[PDB]
Amino acid sequence: ATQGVFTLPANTRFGVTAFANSSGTQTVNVLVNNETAATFSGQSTNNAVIGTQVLNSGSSGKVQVQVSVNGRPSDLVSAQVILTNELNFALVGSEDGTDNDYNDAVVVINWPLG
Amino acid sequence: ATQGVFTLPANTRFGVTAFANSSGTQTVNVLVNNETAATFSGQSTNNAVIGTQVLNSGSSGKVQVQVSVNGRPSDLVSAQVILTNELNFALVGSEDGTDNDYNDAVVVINWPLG
Amino acid sequence: ATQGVFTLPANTRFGVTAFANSSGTQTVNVLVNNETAATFSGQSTNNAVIGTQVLNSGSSGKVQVQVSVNGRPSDLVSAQVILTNELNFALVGSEDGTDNDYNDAVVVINWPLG
Amino acid sequence: ATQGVFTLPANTRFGVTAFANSSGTQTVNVLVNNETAATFSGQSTNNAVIGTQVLNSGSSGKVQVQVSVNGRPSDLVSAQVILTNELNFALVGSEDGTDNDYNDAVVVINWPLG
Ligand SMILES: CC(=O)N[C@@H]1[C@@H](O[C@@H]2O[C@@H](C)[C@@H](O)[C@@H](O)[C@@H]2O)[C@H](O[C@@H]2O[C@H](CO)[C@H](O)[C@H](O)[C@H]2O)[C@@H](CO)O[C@H]1O
Ligand SMILES: CC(=O)N[C@@H]1[C@@H](O[C@@H]2O[C@@H](C)[C@@H](O)[C@@H](O)[C@@H]2O)[C@H](O[C@@H]2O[C@H](CO)[C@H](O)[C@H](O)[C@H]2O)[C@@H](CO)O[C@H]1O
Ligand SMILES: CC(=O)N[C@@H]1[C@@H](O[C@@H]2O[C@@H](C)[C@@H](O)[C@@H](O)[C@@H]2O)[C@H](O[C@@H]2O[C@H](CO)[C@H](O)[C@H](O)[C@H]2O)[C@@H](CO)O[C@H]1O
Ligand SMILES: CC(=O)N[C@@H]1[C@@H](O[C@@H]2O[C@@H](C)[C@@H](O)[C@@H](O)[C@@H]2O)[C@H](O[C@@H]2O[C@H](CO)[C@H](O)[C@H](O)[C@H]2O)[C@@H](CO)O[C@H]1O
Ligand SMILES: [Ca+2]
Ligand SMILES: [Ca+2]
Ligand SMILES: [Ca+2]
Ligand SMILES: [Ca+2]
Ligand SMILES: [Ca+2]
Ligand SMILES: [Ca+2]
Ligand SMILES: [Ca+2]
Ligand SMILES: [Ca+2]
Question: What Gene Ontology biological process does one annotation of this record name (chains A, B, C, D) (predicted)?
């Protein structure tokens, strides 16, 4: 199944934050309405924040997370969770190798903000 | 029900990251085995990362998040999500006021690391 | 925080299914736009299905689950989870006593159907 | 990523329940330590509960859900969620066709019981 694709409410600010846990430099692309809206890159084996941004979900609310290591797409896993019918998390993990820890880049999207 | 309390695997490194979305200064305390292990403070209405740390779950694996705003405890909501049977997120939202957006401090715990 | 309250898409059919794990007879009320739309009641310590039904979320999409044991309201825990941006679960646990297993009535709401 | 595989606590009773939403007859297999422990089957476009059973997770705690429609394996999506650090749901959706509703067989595993 498709992973790393979320429908947010239209025209809504959201946070995106990426962490790294891999020997490889992670490249995280965040697409809004099928166009690149933010790109992060960094390397850490200690959960370093390689990127954090506030974006607008745009008129469609379509947000996609892609992860690559030296141009090779990582295998993604994802889910959305809503707490108390208000607080939204869109969560992505990614696997760049064979150990299947799925933490090589970790991306958290959260809304609403403010 | 109790919220903001999670049992991790023993002796396991985890990341904890806090975000703020409120007029009020958030204080986020992260306890391991009932002992303060990290404290973050800050004020943002735009999802600032008021802090991020790597901690060890220790012999009990017990991790608790507490949030307060000038010494008043915020109301918490929480859940844990596991992707592909391997990648763990422990999620907390908090409310300092009356609007019930539960984003006033947002805390994300993730493991495993590395 | 409020629990057992979910906003579904308007005018959308959903499944609601309850299970029991308690010495107490569980009463599960499902409200749609603040009106009782289904009531299940039953007793099991072995996860028996005490009721299943398909409802329509109506113009508001507001669905609420309440659980009581002989008119005593149970404490609830809840969350919504979305897989591959398509499949929705609204999950409720409930506690009627002192052991805090929160399984005394378990309610699963799922959509879309068909 | 692998989907429909969950590590439960060893030697623990759990509920497994399947729902159908498809023109195709669903077959759900539930494996415990890599051996078939339960098989459910039915055909519904209205969320019929085609099976529900209580199983034991056995010494490994490994539970796997597989879905097929006239011998063709369906594509799976899954996650586990934990509420109040106690109540566990392991969730599976499946796709037998081209519309990607992922509801064609829906499986819910819940523990603890009793
Ligand atoms: C792109 C990349 O560097 N992947 C492979 C490495 O595995 C990554 O980095 C390590 C440190 C872990 O974070 C992995 O989960 C991640 O996919 C790999 O590094 C080795 O991984 C071992 C477990 O897979 C173990 O941690 C070992 O200590 C570490 O060196 C290197 C070397 O095998 O190969 C890359 O292709
Ligand atoms: C600790 C504190 O200041 N809390 C209340 C204020 O609300 C907080 O800050 C605002 C900016 C939002 O992030 C709220 O979610 C958060 O709880 C509250 O401030 C007012 O909140 C309104 C919504 O309730 C709206 O954002 C408004 O613009 C903002 O000024 C003040 C006034 O009600 O009360 C505090 O309790
Ligand atoms: C409605 C009710 O009777 N609630 C409490 C009882 O506990 C319920 O039923 C038992 C079988 C468990 O499913 C509990 O999770 C559930 O809340 C409680 O019954 C006792 O619960 C013990 C564990 O707390 C244990 O299972 C024991 O066998 C059982 O008798 C009674 C008496 O403690 O109190 C009610 O409040
Ligand atoms: C196993 C099978 O028959 N799969 C496809 C059919 O779609 C399944 O059944 C329908 C009723 C829905 O529950 C689907 O989600 C499910 O995968 C499919 O039947 C047609 O599906 C349409 C949407 O793709 C629509 O629901 C229509 O009413 C129904 O006839 C058939 C024919 O397109 O193709 C199979 O692959
Ligand atoms: Ca890896
Ligand atoms: Ca890694
Ligand atoms: Ca607030
Ligand atoms: Ca706020
Ligand atoms: Ca109980
Ligand atoms: Ca019980
Ligand atoms: Ca389908
Ligand atoms: Ca279907």
Answer: single-species biofilm formation
D1-114 in CATH: which number? 2.60.120.400
C101 backbone φψ class: left, alpha, beta (φ>0; ψ -120 to 50) = alpha
Compare CB distances from D47 to C46, C93, C110 and report the shortest one's residue: C110
What's the gap between Cα C3 and its chain centre?
Answer: 10
Please report the atom of ligand 2 found closest to the CA of residue B95.
17
Residue C33 is classified by DSSP as: T
**Burial readout A19-39 (b: 16 or more C-beta within 10 A, e: otherwise):** bbbbebbbbbbbbbeeeebbe
Q: Left if phi > 0, otherwise alpha if psi is -120 to 50, otherwise beta: which for A69?
A: beta
* Resolution number, Å: 1.8
Nearest Cα residue to atom 32 of ligand 1: A23
The answer to whether the Cα torsion of D56, D62, D63, D67 is positive or negative is negative
What stretches of chain B adopt beta strand conformation (E)?
A: 5-7, 13-20, 26-32, 35-42, 48-56, 62-69, 72-73, 75-83, 87-95, 105-111
Q: Say if strands D35-42 and D26-32 run parallel, antiparallel, or are unpaired.
A: antiparallel
Residue A63's nearest CA partner among A41, A30, A16 is A30
Instruction: Answer whether B83 sits within 8 Å of A78, measured CB to CB.
Output: yes
**DSSP result, B75-103:** EEEEEEEEETTTEEEEEEEEESSSS---B
**Beta sheet of B87-95, edge-to-edge order:** B48-56, B13-20, B105-111, B87-95, B75-83, D75-83, D87-95, D105-111, D13-20, D48-56
CA B2 to CA D87: how far, in whole Å? 12
Report the C-alpha gap between D46 and B98 in whole angstroms. Answer: 40
Which structural technique was applied? Answer: X-ray
